[PDB]
Amino acid sequence: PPYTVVYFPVRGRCAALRMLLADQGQSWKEEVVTVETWQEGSLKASCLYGQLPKFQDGDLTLYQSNTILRHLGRTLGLYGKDQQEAALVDMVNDGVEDLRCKYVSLIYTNYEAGKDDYVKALPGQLKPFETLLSQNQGGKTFIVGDQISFADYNLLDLLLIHEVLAPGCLDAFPLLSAYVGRLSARPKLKAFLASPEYVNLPINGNGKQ
Amino acid sequence: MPPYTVVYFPVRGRCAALRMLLADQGQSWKEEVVTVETWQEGSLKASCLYGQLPKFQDGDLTLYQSNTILRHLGRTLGLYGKDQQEAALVDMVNDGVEDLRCKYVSLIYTNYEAGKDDYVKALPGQLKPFETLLSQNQGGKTFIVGDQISFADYNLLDLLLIHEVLAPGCLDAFPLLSAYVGRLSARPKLKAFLASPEYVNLPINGNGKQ
Numbered sequence: 508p509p510y511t512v513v514y515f516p517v518r519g520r521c522a523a524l525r526m527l528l529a530d531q532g533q534s535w536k537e538e539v540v541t542v543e544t545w546q547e548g549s550l551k552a553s554c555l556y557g558q559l560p561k562f563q564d565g566d567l568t569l570y571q572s573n574t575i576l577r578h579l580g581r582t583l584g585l586y587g588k589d590q591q592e593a594a595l596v597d598m599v600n601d602g603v604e605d606l607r608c609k610y611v612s613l614i615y616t617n618y619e620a621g622k623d624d625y626v627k628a629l630p631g632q633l634k635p636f637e638t639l640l641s642q643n644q645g646g647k648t649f650i651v652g653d654q655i656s657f658a659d660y661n662l663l664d665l666l667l668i669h670e671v672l673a674p675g676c677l678d679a680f681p682l683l684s685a686y687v688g689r690l691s692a693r694p695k696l697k698a699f700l701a702s703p704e705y706v707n708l709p710i711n712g713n714g715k716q
Numbered sequence: 717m718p719p720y721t722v723v724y725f726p727v728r729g730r731c732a733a734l735r736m737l738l739a740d741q742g743q744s745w746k747e748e749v750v751t752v753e754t755w756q757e758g759s760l761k762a763s764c765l766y767g768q769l770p771k772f773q774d775g776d777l778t779l780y781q782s783n784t785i786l787r788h789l790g791r792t793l794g795l796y797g798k799d800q801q802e803a804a805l806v807d808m809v810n811d812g813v814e815d816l817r818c819k820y821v822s823l824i825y826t827n828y829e830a831g832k833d834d835y836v837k838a839l840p841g842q843l844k845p846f847e848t849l850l851s852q853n854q855g856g857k858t859f860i861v862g863d864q865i866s867f868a869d870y871n872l873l874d875l876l877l878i879h880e881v882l883a884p885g886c887l888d889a890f891p892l893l894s895a896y897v898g899r900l901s902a903r904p905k906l907k908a909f910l911a912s913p914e915y916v917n918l919p920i921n922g923n924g925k926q
């Protein structure tokens with residue numbers, strides 16, 4: 508594999524980049540890190556910001572999940588057709604990251620106490636993405652332009668973990684609903700999503716979702 | 717008229733890095749200031765994609781998201797490394813910067829009185845990675861990545877400046893970051909901007925805490 512992913516045995520911040528690699532027909536190696544090996548301290552001290560994931564592309568070593576996504580977007584051509592599209596791809600990815608940050612905070616620090624409020628506020632957080640789709644060819648292709656981008660995989664991951672969190676949360680959004688159906692049916696991605704390496708890994712660290 | 721417009725509250729906040737980049741690159745731009753009062757009316761907010769500022773216009777291209785604005789400018793002004801490897805390291809630095817900015821913002825706006833002491837205590841460990849990056853790039857003598865300035869240097873510069881206001885002397889434990897701040901603040905167009913009323917006379921954050 509020109510690629511190595513180093514991470515804990517969870518989907519978490521590596522699900523989108525794994526979907527991207529599978530859908531793009533790329534091979535990669537998973538190096539898993541147990542809470543025991545990490546807890547020790549050795550690898551953590553060697554990680555730039557003391558966190559995972561860690562990714563290797565040949566001799567290039569990178570940290571930061573959005574950095575890995577952008578790198579694969581640049582090198583495999585999933586970053587829009589021109590600078591204008593590349594800017595909009597970024598804009599969608601940063602909006603996905605902002606919601607992902609709220610989700611992680613719910614999961615890891617206020618699950619049973621914050622859940623109902625999170626779900627109640629959910630439709631307002633997803634509307635921007637339905638609006639974006641509505642402005643790009645009636646929401647019949649991808650989030651930006653008419654070719655898939657790295658932001659499509661991150662957005663897809665985000666919508667799917669939110670349907671696990673609040674079943675039917677996309678029922679009120681036709682374009683977002685259809686987009687998930689369509690992307691999930693791309694041949695290589697459909698196979699990946701149905702596979703044990705994806706299905707049998709917990710979404711998060713602590714058993715909550 | 718300038719092709720660029722920045723729409724934001726009258727604070728340095730998340731626009732300080734992108735204003736330093738435009739000033740340093742000798743670009744002109746227009747500022748459209750939104751008062752707390754205009755924002756409470758509610759109409760401009762309902763029109764923003766994610767309900768927040770900043771908002772930036774390049775010609776008819778309207779962008780939201782502070783890091784998206786930096787990356788767009790990095791692309792169009794040639795401040796994104798000399799090749800693909802360099803762009804990925806630029807991204808890695810910027811995301812590190814954003815992670816620390818997020819913690820800084822949380823402190824300033826939701827826990828300043830009680831969290832300031834723990835935050836300052838944990839700071840050296842949050843700044844070390846940037847000293848390390850500098851140490852690996854030509855002995856910390858040039859920029860954070862490669863040997864041309866990138867958008868990440870401006871964002872990193874702002875983050876280091878606001879942390880020197882929060883914990884004066886916090887960079888004394890970091891020789892490469894200290895010299896780097898002094899070397900960048902000395903660039904002719906940037907030095908002029910940093911000492912001008914339009915920078916100096918805006919508060920760093922919205923609530924009187926810094």
Ligand SMILES: CCCCCCSC[C@H](NC(=O)CC[C@H]([NH3+])C(=O)O)C(=O)NCC(=O)O
Binds near residue numbers: 515
């Ligand atoms: C063990 C439970 C599994 C939980 C997985 C959640 S993500 C793992 C967490 N890493 C991050 O949060 C990385 C954030 C970084 N901004 C990125 O986007 O890559 C970490 O390494 N934390 C370990 C640490 O901080 O030491």
Ligand SMILES: CCCCCCSC[C@H](NC(=O)CC[C@H]([NH3+])C(=O)O)C(=O)NCC(=O)O
Binds near residue numbers: 730922
């Ligand atoms: C007058 C107070 C000073 C403003 C605080 C500094 S940033 C303002 C805040 N915007 C953001 O948090 C932007 C986060 C966004 N991820 C970005 O990187 O651009 C906002 O628009 N908030 C307004 C709102 O959310 O309604």
